[PDB]
Design a protein around this ligand. Structure first.
Ligand code: CLA
Ligand code: CLA
Ligand code: CLA
Ligand code: CLA
Ligand code: CLA
Ligand code: CLA
Ligand code: CLA
Ligand code: CLA
Ligand SMILES: CC1=C(/C=C/C(C)=C/C=C/C(C)=C/C=C/C=C(C)/C=C/C=C(C)/C=C/C2=C(C)CCCC2(C)C)C(C)(C)CCC1
Ligand SMILES: CC1=C(/C=C/C(C)=C/C=C/C(C)=C/C=C/C=C(C)/C=C/C=C(C)/C=C/C2=C(C)CCCC2(C)C)C(C)(C)CCC1
Ligand SMILES: CC1=C(/C=C/C(C)=C/C=C/C(C)=C\C=C\C=C(C)\C=C\C=C(C)\C=C\C2=C(C)CCCC2(C)C)C(C)(C)CCC1
Lengths: 107, 80, 141, 30, 135, 61, 31, 29, 739
C-alpha cells in the first residue's frame, strides 16, 4: 500500500539521477506502471532468487526459440502439406497451447 | 477535354499507347525515329488525364505531354 | 557586460543556488565543483551564468574556444567525408562503396583528417576544391 | 448618444453609396 | 447490331447508373473459346459463355480494363461500342480494327509537335493570344 | 562523336544537362536524334540512356 | 432607435442570405 | 575578372562593420 | 452549357460542382478571363480599385457611426484610463439572461462589445470630443465612399475609359503620388494637427464653425512669411500639461521635444505636426524628380538603360545591368503587385514595431489589450502581404517574365545562380534551426534535471549595444548618446540635438516599451524569428525561382502558377507547382508570426504585471513558454463559461474552441486527399439514385470531390482562420481578463 513499484534505476550522469525518485522501501528508481509486481505477487514469487531463476529460464527459452527458428528454416523446414493441416493445428493449439496451458496454470 | 501533345523526341517504343486506360493514343507511321512509328492522340476527348502515358515514356525529357484542360464527364471519369 | 550582469562569485542569487547545488554525477562534490567553476562566469540577477560571445578575449572560453574546437572537429568530419566520396568515385562499384564502407580506403582518410585545414587551403588555391558552373547540372531558366 | 433622426439621415445617406455600389458592380460585370 | 448473351453472375451495385439512360453507355463484346470465370470491371466474379458475350459498362475505361483481363484469357477479339440515348451504337475500340499499340498504315499524326519539349515558347510570348505554349 | 566518346549534354530540359555521358552508338541514318548516350547516374524515371542530336553534344575526351 | 437592431439583424441574418442564395442559385443554374 | 569593384565595395561594408565594432569595444568614443 | 461563369467557357461547360468552386477562385483573376485584352484588363482593374477604396471608406464610416451611436466615447473622454471603450451593441436573440447580464458592461444599458481597435484613443488624440463629431465623420465618409463608387462607374464609360499609354505613364504617377497623394496628404494632416488636434489638446474647441476666425498661433502666419519660424517652437506644452485642458498648455504649433507627453505617455502632437510638415516638404520635393510633360526631370527607362558613368563606361546603375527592368516593372502587373506587396508588408511590420514602442495616441500605452490587439493585427497583416509579395513574384516569373526582353540584366543573373541562392537559404535555415532548437532543448533538459545554472544563456550584446548607442544607460556601456562626451551626444559643431533631452528621458524611464531591456530569453527568440524569416523566404524564393521549371519538371512554365502535380511518374510530383510553395510558405508565415506575437505578448504581460523576472528566467526553455505563457494565461479564458455560470469572456472562450475546431477541420483537407473522397461520393450518388422517394429530386451539377488544388486552398483557409481566431481569443481574453 505504501511502497511504490520501481524496477528501473538510472545511472548518475549529466544530472539524470534526479529520475531515481524516493519510491519507498529505502529504494531510488523510476516508478514502473507495467504491473509486473502485481503479476509476480499473483504468481506467488516472494524473493529475488525466484525472479533470477525465472529470468535465466527465459534466456534459455529465448535461446531455444532462436535455435528453433534457425533449425526450422536452415536445417529441417516443413513442407506446405505440414502448414496446411489447419484441423491438426487448431486441435493442438486449442488442447495443448490453451487447454493444457490453462490446466498447467490451474495446477 | 485534356490536350495530349507528342514531341519529335519520340522513339516509337509504344509504351504510352499500351499504358493508356481509355485508348486515347495509337502508333502511326513515321520516318523520324529508327522504330519508324510515332505516338498520336486522336481520341483526347476520352483522355482522363491520369498521365500513365508520361510515366510510361522512356525519353528525357518526355516525348508525350498531357496538359489538363476543360473538365468534362469523360475527363472527370464519372460513371454518373 | 550589460543587463544586470555581475561576477557570479559576487551575485547573492548564485551563492544561494550553490548552497543547494545538485550532484550531476556519482561524485558527491560534483554539485559544489560546478559552482566553483561557474564562479568565474558573469551571472544575471537570478544567478545563472550568462555567456558573452562578442569575441572578448577575457570571455574566450564562453564561445571563441568552443567555436575553434567545433570548427576543427566538424571540418575534419566534412573533409574525411569528402575525401572518401572522391576516393570511391575512381572505382567501378561506387554506389556499393557508399552503403558498404571500404574500410581499407576509409580508415587511412579518417587517420589523415587531422591535417584538413592545410588540405582545404592547398585545394582552395589549386582550383581543385570546386567544379566549374558550366560542368555542373542545372535546371532550365 | 446621437438622436433617432441622425440615425435615419445616416441610413438614407447610406442608400446613395448603396445605389452607386450596385451601378459599379453591374458595370464591372460587363 | 450488338450480338452476345450477358455473362452469368453479371449483377452488382457497381453497374449502370442514370448516366447510361441520360448521357451515354458502353458495351464490350467478345467471343470466348470456353465458359470461364472473370472479375467484372466494378467487382463480382462473372462467368463468360462459350461464344459471343455482351457486357454493358458505364465508362470506356471499364471496357479497356476488361479488354486487358480478356488478353490474359488469350482473347483479343473484344470490341467496345459507345451507345447514345437515341440508340446510336458507334464502334470505338479498336478504332480501325487494328489495336492502337500495333502500327497501321492510313493513320495520320494527331497533335504532333515537330520540336523537342524544351523548344516550346514562353507563356509571356503567347499572352493575350488565343494559342497556348504547346500549340 | 562516335562509340565510346565522352560527351557533355547541351539540351536544357535533359536531366543530364551539363553532365558527361558515354556515346553508346550513333545511328547512321536521317533520324533527328541519332546519338544514343548512356549515363552513370539514373534520371528521376530511373533510366540511364537517352537519344541526342550531334548539336546537343560537346565531345570532351 | 435601438429597435432598428430588431429589424436589421434578422434581415442580415435571414432575408439577405435567402434573397442572395436564392438569386445566386438561380444564376449558377441558368442555361 | 580580378573582382576589383565588388571586393572594393565588400571591403567598404567590412570597414563600416569594423568601425561600428570599434564603437562597441570603446576604441573610438 | 450554363451561363456562369461568364468569364470562362471551360468552367461554364463543366457538368460537375467543380464549375461553381473554380468560378469563385477565378472571379478576380481578370488576366485569365475569356477574351481579356491588356487595355480592358487595366480599365477593369482601375474601376475595381475605386470599388475597393469605397469599401475601405464604408468600413471606416461603420467604426465612426457604431461608436457615435452605441459607444461610450463622451464618457470615455472624461476617464480614458478606467472607462472601457464600447465597439458596438449586441442584439443576439440566442442569449439567455445570464449572458445579457454578463455582456452589460462599460456602463452600457444593454449588452455591448468592448473595442480593442484603439479607435477611441486615435479619435480623441486627433481632436474629436463629441458623438456628433464622430457621426459627422461617418456621414462624410459615406459621401466620400459614394464619390469613389461613382468615379469607378464613370471611368468604365466609353469617353472616360483611360488608354493603355495612360496606365503605363509611370513617371507622371510617381510625381503625382509622391508630391500629391503622400506629400500634400502629409501637409494637409500637419494642417489638421496644427488647426484642430493641438488646440483641442489644449482645451480649445476648434471646429468647422470657428476654425477660419481662430488662428492656430498668436503670431498668426506673419513669422512664416518673414522667416522667423522659431516663433512656432516658442512656449511648448509643459511637463505639467493635462491633455484636453489649458492647465500646463503651451502656444507652440511646431516643437521638436522628443520622447513622450508625460501624462498621456504618447508622442507630443507638436512633434507629430512638425513631423508631417517636414515629411510633406520632403515628399513634394521628391515628386519633382521624374519628367512628365515639361522636359525637366529624370527618365527611369534612361536611368535603367544608362551605360556611361561620366565618360567611363559601366554595365549600368551601380555597374549592374538594369536594362529592360523599367519595361519588366511597367509592363507586368504581377511584378508590380508583388513588389508593392513586399513594400507594404515591410511598412506594415514597421508600423507594428513602432506603434507599441512609440505610441502616438493619448493613453493607448495603458490600454494593454488594445496595444496587444493592434501589434498582433498588423504583424499578421504584414505576414500575409509578405507571402503575397512572393506569390505574385512567382506568378510574374511563370506568366509575365520574358527572358529575351531581360537579356543580360540583374533579373536574368539572379535566375542564373538560383541554385546558389536556394542552397545558401537552405543552409542558413538549417544552421539557425539546428542550433536554436538545440540550445532550447539543452536549456529545457538541464532545467528539467534541476540544474538551471547549466543553461546556455547568450546575452544579446549587439542589440544591447544598439540600445546603449540610443542612450539607454542601464547596460553601462558609455557609447554614442549613452556617452555624454561623444560627438553623437553633443553634436560637436552645431549642438542642435534638441530631440535628445526628451528622447533620453523616454529611453531611460523603465515605465514604457521604448527599447525594452533584453537578455538571454530575447536572444533565443530573435534567433527563432530569424529561423522563421529565413525558412519562409527559402520556401517562397525556391517557389519563385523554380516556378518556370526544375530538373523534375523542366517545362513547368507551360502548366502555369497553380496545378495539382505532374502525376506519380518520375518518382512522384505532389506539390511541385509554384502555387504549392505559397501554400507551404503560409504555414511557416503563420508559425513565424506565432513566435513573434507570443514573444511580444509574454514579454509585455511580464512588463504590465511588473514581473519581467518571469519572462527573463523562464523564456530560456520551451517548458517555460508552454507553462508560464500558454497554460498559465489560459486559466481565465477557458472559465469564460463553466457549470457555475458565464462572464464577459464567454464569447472568447467559445471563439477559442471555434478556432481549435476550424484549425482541426483544416487538417482533414490537408491530410486526406481527393481519391478517397471521390470514391466515397460515388457511393452517395449511387444511394441517392436508388433511394425510392429521394430519387424524385436530382442535382443539376454532378457531385464530385474537391480538386487537389481546391483541397489545399480549403485546407489552408480552415487552418489559417483557425490559427487567427484561436490566438485572437487567447490574446484578448488573457489580457482583458488580467486588465
Ligand atoms: C505488443 C506489445 C505488448 C506489451 C509490451 C504488453 C505488456 C504487458 N502486458 Mg499485454 N497483451 C498484448 C500485447 C502487449 N502487452 C496482446 C496483443 C494481448 C492479447 C493476448 C495481451 C494480453 C495481456 C493479458 C491478459 C495481460 C497482459 C499483461 C501485460 C503487462 C505485464 C507483462 C507480463 O509479464 O504479464 C504476463 C501475462 C500474464 C501473467 C497473463 C497471461 C494470460 C493470457 C490470457 C495468456 C494468453 C496466451 C495465449 C497463448 C495468447 C492468446 C492466444 C489466443 C488469442 C488464441 C505488460 C504491461 C498482464 C498485465 O496487465 O499485468 C498487470 C496481463 O494480465 N497482456
Ligand atoms: C502453465 C503452467 C505453469 C506456469 C506458466 C508456471 C510458472 C511458474 N511456476 Mg509453476 N507449477 C505448475 C505450472 C506452471 N507454473 C504446476 C502444474 C505445478 C505443480 C507441480 C507447479 C509447481 C511450482 C512450484 C513448486 C514452483 C513453481 C514456480 C513457478 C514460477 C517460477 C518459474 C521458474 O523458477 O523458472 C513461474 C511463475 C516456482 C516459484 O517460484 O513460484 C512462486 C516454484 O518454486 N511452480
Ligand atoms: C495441471 C497440473 C497439475 C499437477 C502437475 C498437479 C500435481 C499434484 N497434485 Mg494437483 N490439482 C490440480 C492440477 C495439478 N496438480 C487441479 C486442476 C486440481 C483441482 C481438481 C488439483 C487438486 C489436487 C488435490 C486435492 C491434490 C492434488 C495433489 C497433487 C500432487 C500429487 C498428485 C498425485 O499423486 O497424482 C501433485 C504434486 C495431491 C497433493 O499431494 O497435494 C499437495 C492432492 O491431495 N491436486
Ligand atoms: C561528406 C559529407 C558531407 C559534406 C562534406 C557536406 C557538405 C555540405 N552540405 Mg551536405 N549532407 C550530407 C553530407 C555532407 N554534406 C548528408 C549525408 C546529408 C543528408 C542529411 C546532407 C544534407 C544536406 C542538406 C539538406 C544541406 C546540406 C548542405 C551542405 C553544405 C553546407 C554545410 C551544411 O549545411 O551541413 C549540413 C549537414 C547535415 C545535413 C548533416 C550531415 C550528416 C553527416 C554528419 C555527414 C555525413 C558524414 C559521413 C557519413 C562520413 C563518412 C566518412 C567515411 C566514409 C570516411 C556543405 C557543402 C547545405 C547546403 O546546400 O549549403 C549550401 C544544405 O542545405 N547537406
Ligand atoms: C443571423 C441571425 C439570426 C437571428 C436573428 C436568429 C433568431 C432566432 N433563432 Mg437562430 N440560428 C441562426 C441565425 C439567427 N437566428 C443560425 C445561423 C443557426 C444555425 C447555427 C441558428 C440556429 C437556431 C436554432 C437551433 C434555434 C434558433 C432559434 C432562434 C429564435 C430564438 C428566439 C426565441 O426563443 O423565440 C421564439 C421564436 C420563434 C419560435 C420563432 C419566431 C418566428 C420565426 C422567426 C419566423 C416566423 C415566420 C416568418 C414571418 C416568415 C418565414 C421565415 C423567414 C423566411 C423569415 C430566434 C428567432 C430557436 C427557435 O426558436 O427556432 C424557431 C432555435 O431553436 N436558431
Ligand atoms: C472588394 C472585393 C471585390 C471586388 C471589388 C470584386 C469585383 C468584381 N468581381 Mg469579384 N470576388 C470577390 C471579391 C471582389 N470582387 C470575392 C471575395 C469572391 C469569392 C471568392 C469573388 C468571386 C467573383 C466571381 C465568381 C465573379 C466575380 C466578378 C467580379 C467583377 C464583377 C462584380 C459583380 O458582378 O458583382 C455583382 C454584385 C452585386 C450586384 C451586389 C453589389 C451591390 C450590393 C449593394 C468585379 C470586377 C465577376 C466577373 O468578373 O464577371 C465578368 C464574377 O463572375 N468575383
Ligand atoms: C494587395 C492586393 C492583392 C491583389 C489585387 C491580388 C490579386 C490577385 N491575386 Mg493575390 N495575393 C495577395 C494580395 C493581392 N492579390 C496576398 C496578400 C496573398 C498572400 C495570401 C496573395 C496570394 C495569392 C495566391 C496564392 C494567388 C493569388 C491570386 C490573385 C489573382 C486572383 C485572385 C482570385 O481570383 O481569388 C478569388 C478569391 C478567393 C478564393 C477568396 C477566398 C479566400 C478568403 C481569404 C477566405 C476567408 C475565409 C472566410 C470568409 C472567413 C470566415 C470567418 C469565420 C469566423 C467563419 C488576382 C490577380 C491567384 C492567381 O492565380 O494570380 C494570377 C492565386 O493563385 N494571390
Ligand atoms: C515542429 C514542427 C516542424 C519542424 C521541427 C520542422 C522542421 C523543418 N522544416 Mg518543416 N514544416 C512544418 C513543420 C515543422 N518543420 C509544417 C507544419 C509544414 C507545412 C507543410 C512544413 C513545411 C516545410 C517546408 C516547405 C520547408 C520546411 C523546412 C523545415 C526545415 C527547416 C530547416 C531548419 O531550420 O531546422 C533544422 C532542422 C530541424 C529543426 C529538424 C529537427 C532536428 C532533430 C530534432 C535532430 C534529430 C537528431 C536526433 C538524434 C534523432 C532522434 C530520432 C531517432 C529516431 C534517431 C526543418 C527541418 C524547410 C527546409 O527543409 O529547409 C532546409 C523547407 O523548405 N518545412
Ligand atoms: C513463467 C515463465 C517461465 C516458466 C514457466 C514454467 C515453469 C512453466 C511450467 C509449466 C508446467 C509445469 C505445465 C504443466 C502442465 C501439465 C499438464 C497440462 C498435464 C495434464 C495432464 C492430464 C491432461 C492428465 C490426464 C489424465 C491422466 C494422465 C490419467 C488419469 C486421467 C486424466 C485425464 C486425469 C519461463 C522459465 C519459461 C520464462 C518465462 C516466464
Ligand atoms: C537600420 C537603420 C538604417 C538603415 C536601414 C536600412 C538600410 C534598411 C534596409 C532595408 C531593406 C534593404 C529592406 C529589404 C526588404 C526586401 C524585401 C522584403 C524583398 C522582397 C522581394 C520580393 C518579394 C520579390 C519578388 C519577386 C520575386 C521573388 C521574383 C521576381 C519578381 C519579383 C522581383 C517581384 C538607417 C541608416 C536609415 C538609420 C538608422 C537605422
Ligand atoms: C569573429 C566572431 C564572430 C563573428 C563572425 C563572423 C561574422 C564570421 C563571418 C564569416 C563568414 C562571412 C564566412 C563565409 C564564408 C563563405 C564561404 C564561401 C565558405 C565556404 C566554405 C567551404 C567551401 C568549406 C568547405 C569544407 C571544408 C573547409 C571542410 C569540410 C568539408 C567542406 C567541403 C564543407 C562572432 C560574433 C559570431 C563570435 C565571436 C567572434
Amino acid at each position: 500500500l505504501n511502497v511504490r513499484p520501481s524496477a528501473q534505476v538510472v545511472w548518475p550522469i549529466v544530472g539524470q539521477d534526479i529520475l531515481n525518485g524516493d519510491v519507498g522501501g529505502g529504494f531510488h528508481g523510476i516508478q514502473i506502471t507495467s504491473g509486473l509486481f502485481q503479476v509476480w505477487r499473483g504468481w506467488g514469487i516472494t524473493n529475488s532468487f525466484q525472479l533470477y531463476c525465472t529470468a535465466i529460464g527465459g534466456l534459455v527459452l529465448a535461446g531455444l526459440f532462436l535455435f528453433a527458428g534457425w533449425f526450422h528454416y536452415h536445417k529441417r523446414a516443413p513442407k506446405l502439406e505440414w502448414f496446411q493441416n489447419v484441423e491438426s493445428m487448431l486441435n493442438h493449439h486449442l488442447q495443448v497451447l490453451l487447454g493444457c496451458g490453462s490446466l498447467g496454470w490451474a495446477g | 477535354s485534356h490536350t495530349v501533345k507528342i514531341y519529335d523526341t519520340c522513339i516509337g517504343c509504344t509504351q504510352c499507347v499500351r499504358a493508356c486506360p481509355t485508348d486515347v493514343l495509337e502508333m502511326v507511321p513515321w520516318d523520324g525515329c529508327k522504330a519508324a512509328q510515332v505516338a498520336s492522340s486522336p481520341r483526347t476527348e476520352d483522355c482522363v488525364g491520369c498521365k500513365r502515358c508520361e510515366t510510361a515514356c522512356p525519353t528525357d525529357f518526355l516525348s508525350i505531354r498531357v496538359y489538363l484542360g476543360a473538365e468534362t464527364t469523360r475527363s472527370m471519369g464519372l460513371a454518373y | 557586460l550589460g543587463a544586470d550582469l555581475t561576477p557570479c562569485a559576487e551575485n547573492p542569487a548564485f551563492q544561494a543556488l550553490a548552497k543547494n547545488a545538485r550532484n550531476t554525477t556519482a561524485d558527491p562534490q560534483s554539485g559544489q565543483k560546478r559552482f566553483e567553476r561557474y564562479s568565474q562566469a558573469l551571472c544575471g540577477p537570478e544567478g545563472y551564468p550568462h555567456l558573452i560571445v562578442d569575441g572578448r578575449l577575457d570571455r574566450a572560453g564562453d564561445f571563441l574556444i568552443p567555436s575553434i574546437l567545433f570548427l576543427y572537429i566538424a571540418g575534419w568530419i566534412g573533409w574525411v567525408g569528402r575525401a572518401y566520396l572522391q576516393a570511391i568515385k575512381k572505382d567501378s562499384d561506387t554506389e556499393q562503396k557508399e552503403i558498404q564502407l571500404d574500410l581499407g580506403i576509409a580508415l587511412p582518410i579518417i587517420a589523415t583528417g587531422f591535417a584538413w585545414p592545410a588540405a582545404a587551403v592547398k585545394e582552395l588555391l589549386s582550383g581543385e576544391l570546386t567544379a566549374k558552373d558550366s560542368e555542373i547540372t542545372v535546371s532550365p531558366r | 448618444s446621437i438622436s433617432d433622426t441622425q440615425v435615419y439621415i445616416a441610413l438614407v445617406v447610406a442608400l446613395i453609396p448603396g445605389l452607386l455600389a450596385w451601378r459599379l458592380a453591374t458595370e464591372l460585370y460587363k | 447490331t450488338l450480338s452476345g448473351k450477358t455473362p452469368l453472375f453479371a449483377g452488382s451495385t457497381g453497374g449502370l447508373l442514370t448516366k447510361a439512360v441520360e448521357e451515354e453507355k458502353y458495351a464490350i463484346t467478345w467471343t470466348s473459346p470456353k465458359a470461364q470465370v472473370f472479375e467484372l470491371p466494378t467487382g463480382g466474379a462473372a462467368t463468360m459463355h462459350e461464344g459471343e458475350n455482351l457486357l454493358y459498362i458505364a465508362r470506356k475505361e471499364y471496357g479497356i480494363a476488361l479488354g486487358g483481363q480478356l488478353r490474359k484469357f488469350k482473347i483479343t477479339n473484344y470490341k467496345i461500342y459507345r451507345i447514345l440515348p437515341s440508340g446510336e451504337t458507334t464502334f470505338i475500340h479498336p478504332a480501325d480494327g487494328v489495336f492502337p499499340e500495333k502500327v497501321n498504315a492510313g493513320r495520320e499524326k494527331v497533335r504532333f509537335n515537330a520540336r523537342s519539349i524544351g523548344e516550346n515558347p514562353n507563356p509571356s510570348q503567347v499572352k493575350f493570344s488565343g494559342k497556348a505554349t504547346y500549340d | 562523336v562516335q562509340r565510346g566518346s565522352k560527351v557533355r549534354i547541351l539540351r536544357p530540359e535533359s536531366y543530364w544537362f551539363q553532365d558527361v555521358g558515354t556515346v553508346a552508338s550513333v545511328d547512321q541514318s536521317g533520324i533527328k536524334y541519332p546519338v544514343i548516350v548512356r549515363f552513370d547516374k539514373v534520371n528521376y524515371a530511373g533510366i540511364n540512356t537517352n537519344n541526342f542530336a550531334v548539336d546537343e553534344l560537346i565531345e570532351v575526351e | 432607435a435601438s429597435f432598428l437592431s430588431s429589424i436589421f439583424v434578422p434581415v442580415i441574418g435571414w432575408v439577405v442570405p435567402i434573397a442572395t442564395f436564392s438569386f445566386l442559385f438561380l444564376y449558377i443554374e441558368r442555361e | 575578372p580580378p573582382y576589383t569593384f565588388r571586393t572594393g565595395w565588400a571591403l567598404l561594408l567590412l570597414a563600416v562593420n569594423f568601425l561600428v565594432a570599434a564603437y562597441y569595444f570603446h576604441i573610438i568614443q | 452549357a450554363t451561363k456562369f461563369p461568364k468569364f470562362s467557357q471551360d468552367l461554364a461547360q463543366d457538368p460537375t460542382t467543380r464549375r461553381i468552386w473554380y468560378a469563385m477562385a477565378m472571379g478576380n483573376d481578370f488576366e485569365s478571363h475569356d477574351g481579356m485584352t491588356e487595355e480592358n484588363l487595366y480599365q477593369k482593374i482601375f474601376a475595381t480599385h475605386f470599388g475597393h477604396l469605397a469599401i475601405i471608406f464604408l468600413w471606416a464610416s461603420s467604426l465612426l457611426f457604431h461608436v457615435a451611436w452605441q459607444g461610450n466615447f463622451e464618457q470615455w473622454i472624461k476617464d480614458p484610463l478606467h472607462v472601457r471603450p464600447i465597439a458596438h451593441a449586441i442584439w443576439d436573440p440566442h442569449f439567455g439572461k445570464p449572458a445579457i447580464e454578463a455582456f452589460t458592461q462599460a456602463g452600457a444599458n444593454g449588452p455591448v462589445n468592448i473595442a480593442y481597435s484603439g479607435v477611441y484613443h486615435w479619435w480623441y488624440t486627433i481632436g474629436m470630443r463629441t458623438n456628433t463629431e464622430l457621426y459627422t465623420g461617418s456621414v462624410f465618409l459615406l459621401l466620400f465612399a459614394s464619390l469613389f463608387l461613382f468615379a469607378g462607374w464613370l471611368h468604365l464609360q466609353p469617353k472616360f475609359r483611360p488608354s493603355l499609354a495612360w496606365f503605363k505613364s509611370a513617371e507622371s504617377r510617381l510625381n503625382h503620388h509622391l508630391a500629391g497623394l503622400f506629400g500634400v496628404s502629409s501637409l494637409a494632416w500637419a494642417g489638421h494637427l496644427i488647426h484642430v488636434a493641438i488646440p483641442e489638446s489644449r482645451g480649445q474647441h476648434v471646429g468647422w464653425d470657428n476654425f477660419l476666425s481662430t488662428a492656430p498661433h498668436p503670431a498668426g502666419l506673419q513669422p512664416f512669411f518673414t522667416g522667423n519660424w522659431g516663433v512656432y517652437a516658442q512656449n511648448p506644452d509643459t511637463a505639467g500639461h493635462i491633455f484636453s485642458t489649458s492647465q500646463g498648455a503651451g502656444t507652440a504649433i511646431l516643437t521638436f521635444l522628443g520622447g513622450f507627453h508625460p501624462q498621456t505617455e504618447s508622442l507630443w502632437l507638436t512633434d507629430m505636426a512638425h513631423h508631417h510638415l517636414a515629411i510633406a516638404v520632403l515628399f513634394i520635393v521628391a515628386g519633382h524628380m521624374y519628367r512628365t510633360n515639361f522636359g525637366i526631370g529624370h527618365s527611369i527607362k534612361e536611368m535603367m538603360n544608362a551605360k556611361t558613368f561620366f565618360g567611363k563606361p559601366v554595365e549600368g546603375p551601380f555597374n549592374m545591368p538594369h536594362q529592360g527592368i523599367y519595361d519588366t516593372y511597367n509592363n507586368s502587373l504581377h511584378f508590380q503587385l508583388g513588389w508593392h506587396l513586399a513594400c507594404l508588408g515591410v511598412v506594415t511590420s514597421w508600423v507594428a514595431q513602432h506603434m507599441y514602442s512609440l505610441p502616438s495616441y493619448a493613453f493607448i500605452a495603458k490600454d494593454y489589450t488594445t496595444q496587444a490587439a493592434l501589434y498582433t493585427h498588423h504583424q499578421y497583416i504584414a505576414i500575409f502581404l509578405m507571402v503575397g509579395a512572393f506569390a505574385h513574384g512567382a506568378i510574374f516569373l511563370v506568366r509575365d517574365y520574358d527572358p529575351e526582353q531581360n537579356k543580360g540584366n540583374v533579373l536574368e543573373r539572379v535566375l542564373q545562380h538560383k541554385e546558389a541562392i536556394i542552397s545558401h537559404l537552405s543552409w542558413v535555415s538549417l544552421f539557425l534551426g539546428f542550433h536554436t532548437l538545440g540550445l532550447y532543448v539543452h536549456n529545457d533538459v538541464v532545467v528539467a534535471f534541476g540544474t538551471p545554472e547549466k543553461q546556455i544563456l547568450i546575452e544579446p550584446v549587439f542589440a544591447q549595444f544598439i540600445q546603449a548607442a540610443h542612450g539607454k544607460v542601464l547596460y553601462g556601456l558609455d557609447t554614442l548618446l549613452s556617452n555624454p562626451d561623444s560627438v553623437a551626444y553633443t553634436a560637436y559643431p552645431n549642438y542642435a540635438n534638441v530631440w535628445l533631452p526628451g528622447w533620453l528621458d523616454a529611453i531611460n524611464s523603465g515605465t514604457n516599451s521604448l527599447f525594452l531591456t533584453i537578455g538571454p530569453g530575447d536572444f533565443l527568440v530573435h534567433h527563432a524569428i530569424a529561423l522563421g524569416l529565413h525558412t519562409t523566404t527559402l520556401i517562397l524564393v525556391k517557389g519563385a525561382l523554380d516556378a518556370r521549371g526544375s530538373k523534375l519538371m523542366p517545362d513547368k512554365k507551360d502548366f502555369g502558377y497553380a496545378f495539382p502535380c505532374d502525376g506519380p511518374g518520375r518518382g512522384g510530383t505532389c506539390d511541385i507547382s509554384a502555387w504549392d510553395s505559397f501554400y507551404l510558405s503560409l504555414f511557416w508565415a503563420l508559425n513565424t508570426v506565432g513566435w513573434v506575437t507570443f514573444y511580444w505578448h509574454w514579454k509585455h504581460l511580464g512588463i504590465w504585471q511588473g514581473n519581467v523576472a518571469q519572462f527573463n528566467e523562464n523564456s530560456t526553455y520551451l517548458m517555460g513558454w508552454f507553462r508560464d505563457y500558454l497554460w498559465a494565461n489560459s486559466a481565465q479564458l477557458i472559465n469564460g463559461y463553466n457549470p457555475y455560470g458565464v462572464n464577459n469572456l464567454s464569447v472568447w472562450a467559445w471563439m477559442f474552441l471555434f478556432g481549435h475546431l476550424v484549425w482541426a477541420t483544416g487538417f482533414m483537407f490537408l491530410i486526406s486527399w481527393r481519391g478517397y473522397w471521390q470514391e466515397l461520393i460515388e457511393t452517395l450518388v449511387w444511394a441517392h439514385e436508388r433511394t425510392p422517394i429521394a430519387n424524385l429530386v436530382r442535382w443539376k451539377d454532378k457531385p464530385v470531390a474537391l480538386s487537389i488544388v481546391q483541397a489545399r486552398v480549403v485546407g489552408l483557409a480552415h487552418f489559417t482562420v483557425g490559427y487567427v481566431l484561436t490566438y485572437a481569443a487567447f490574446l484578448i481574453a488573457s489580457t482583458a481578463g488580467k486588465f
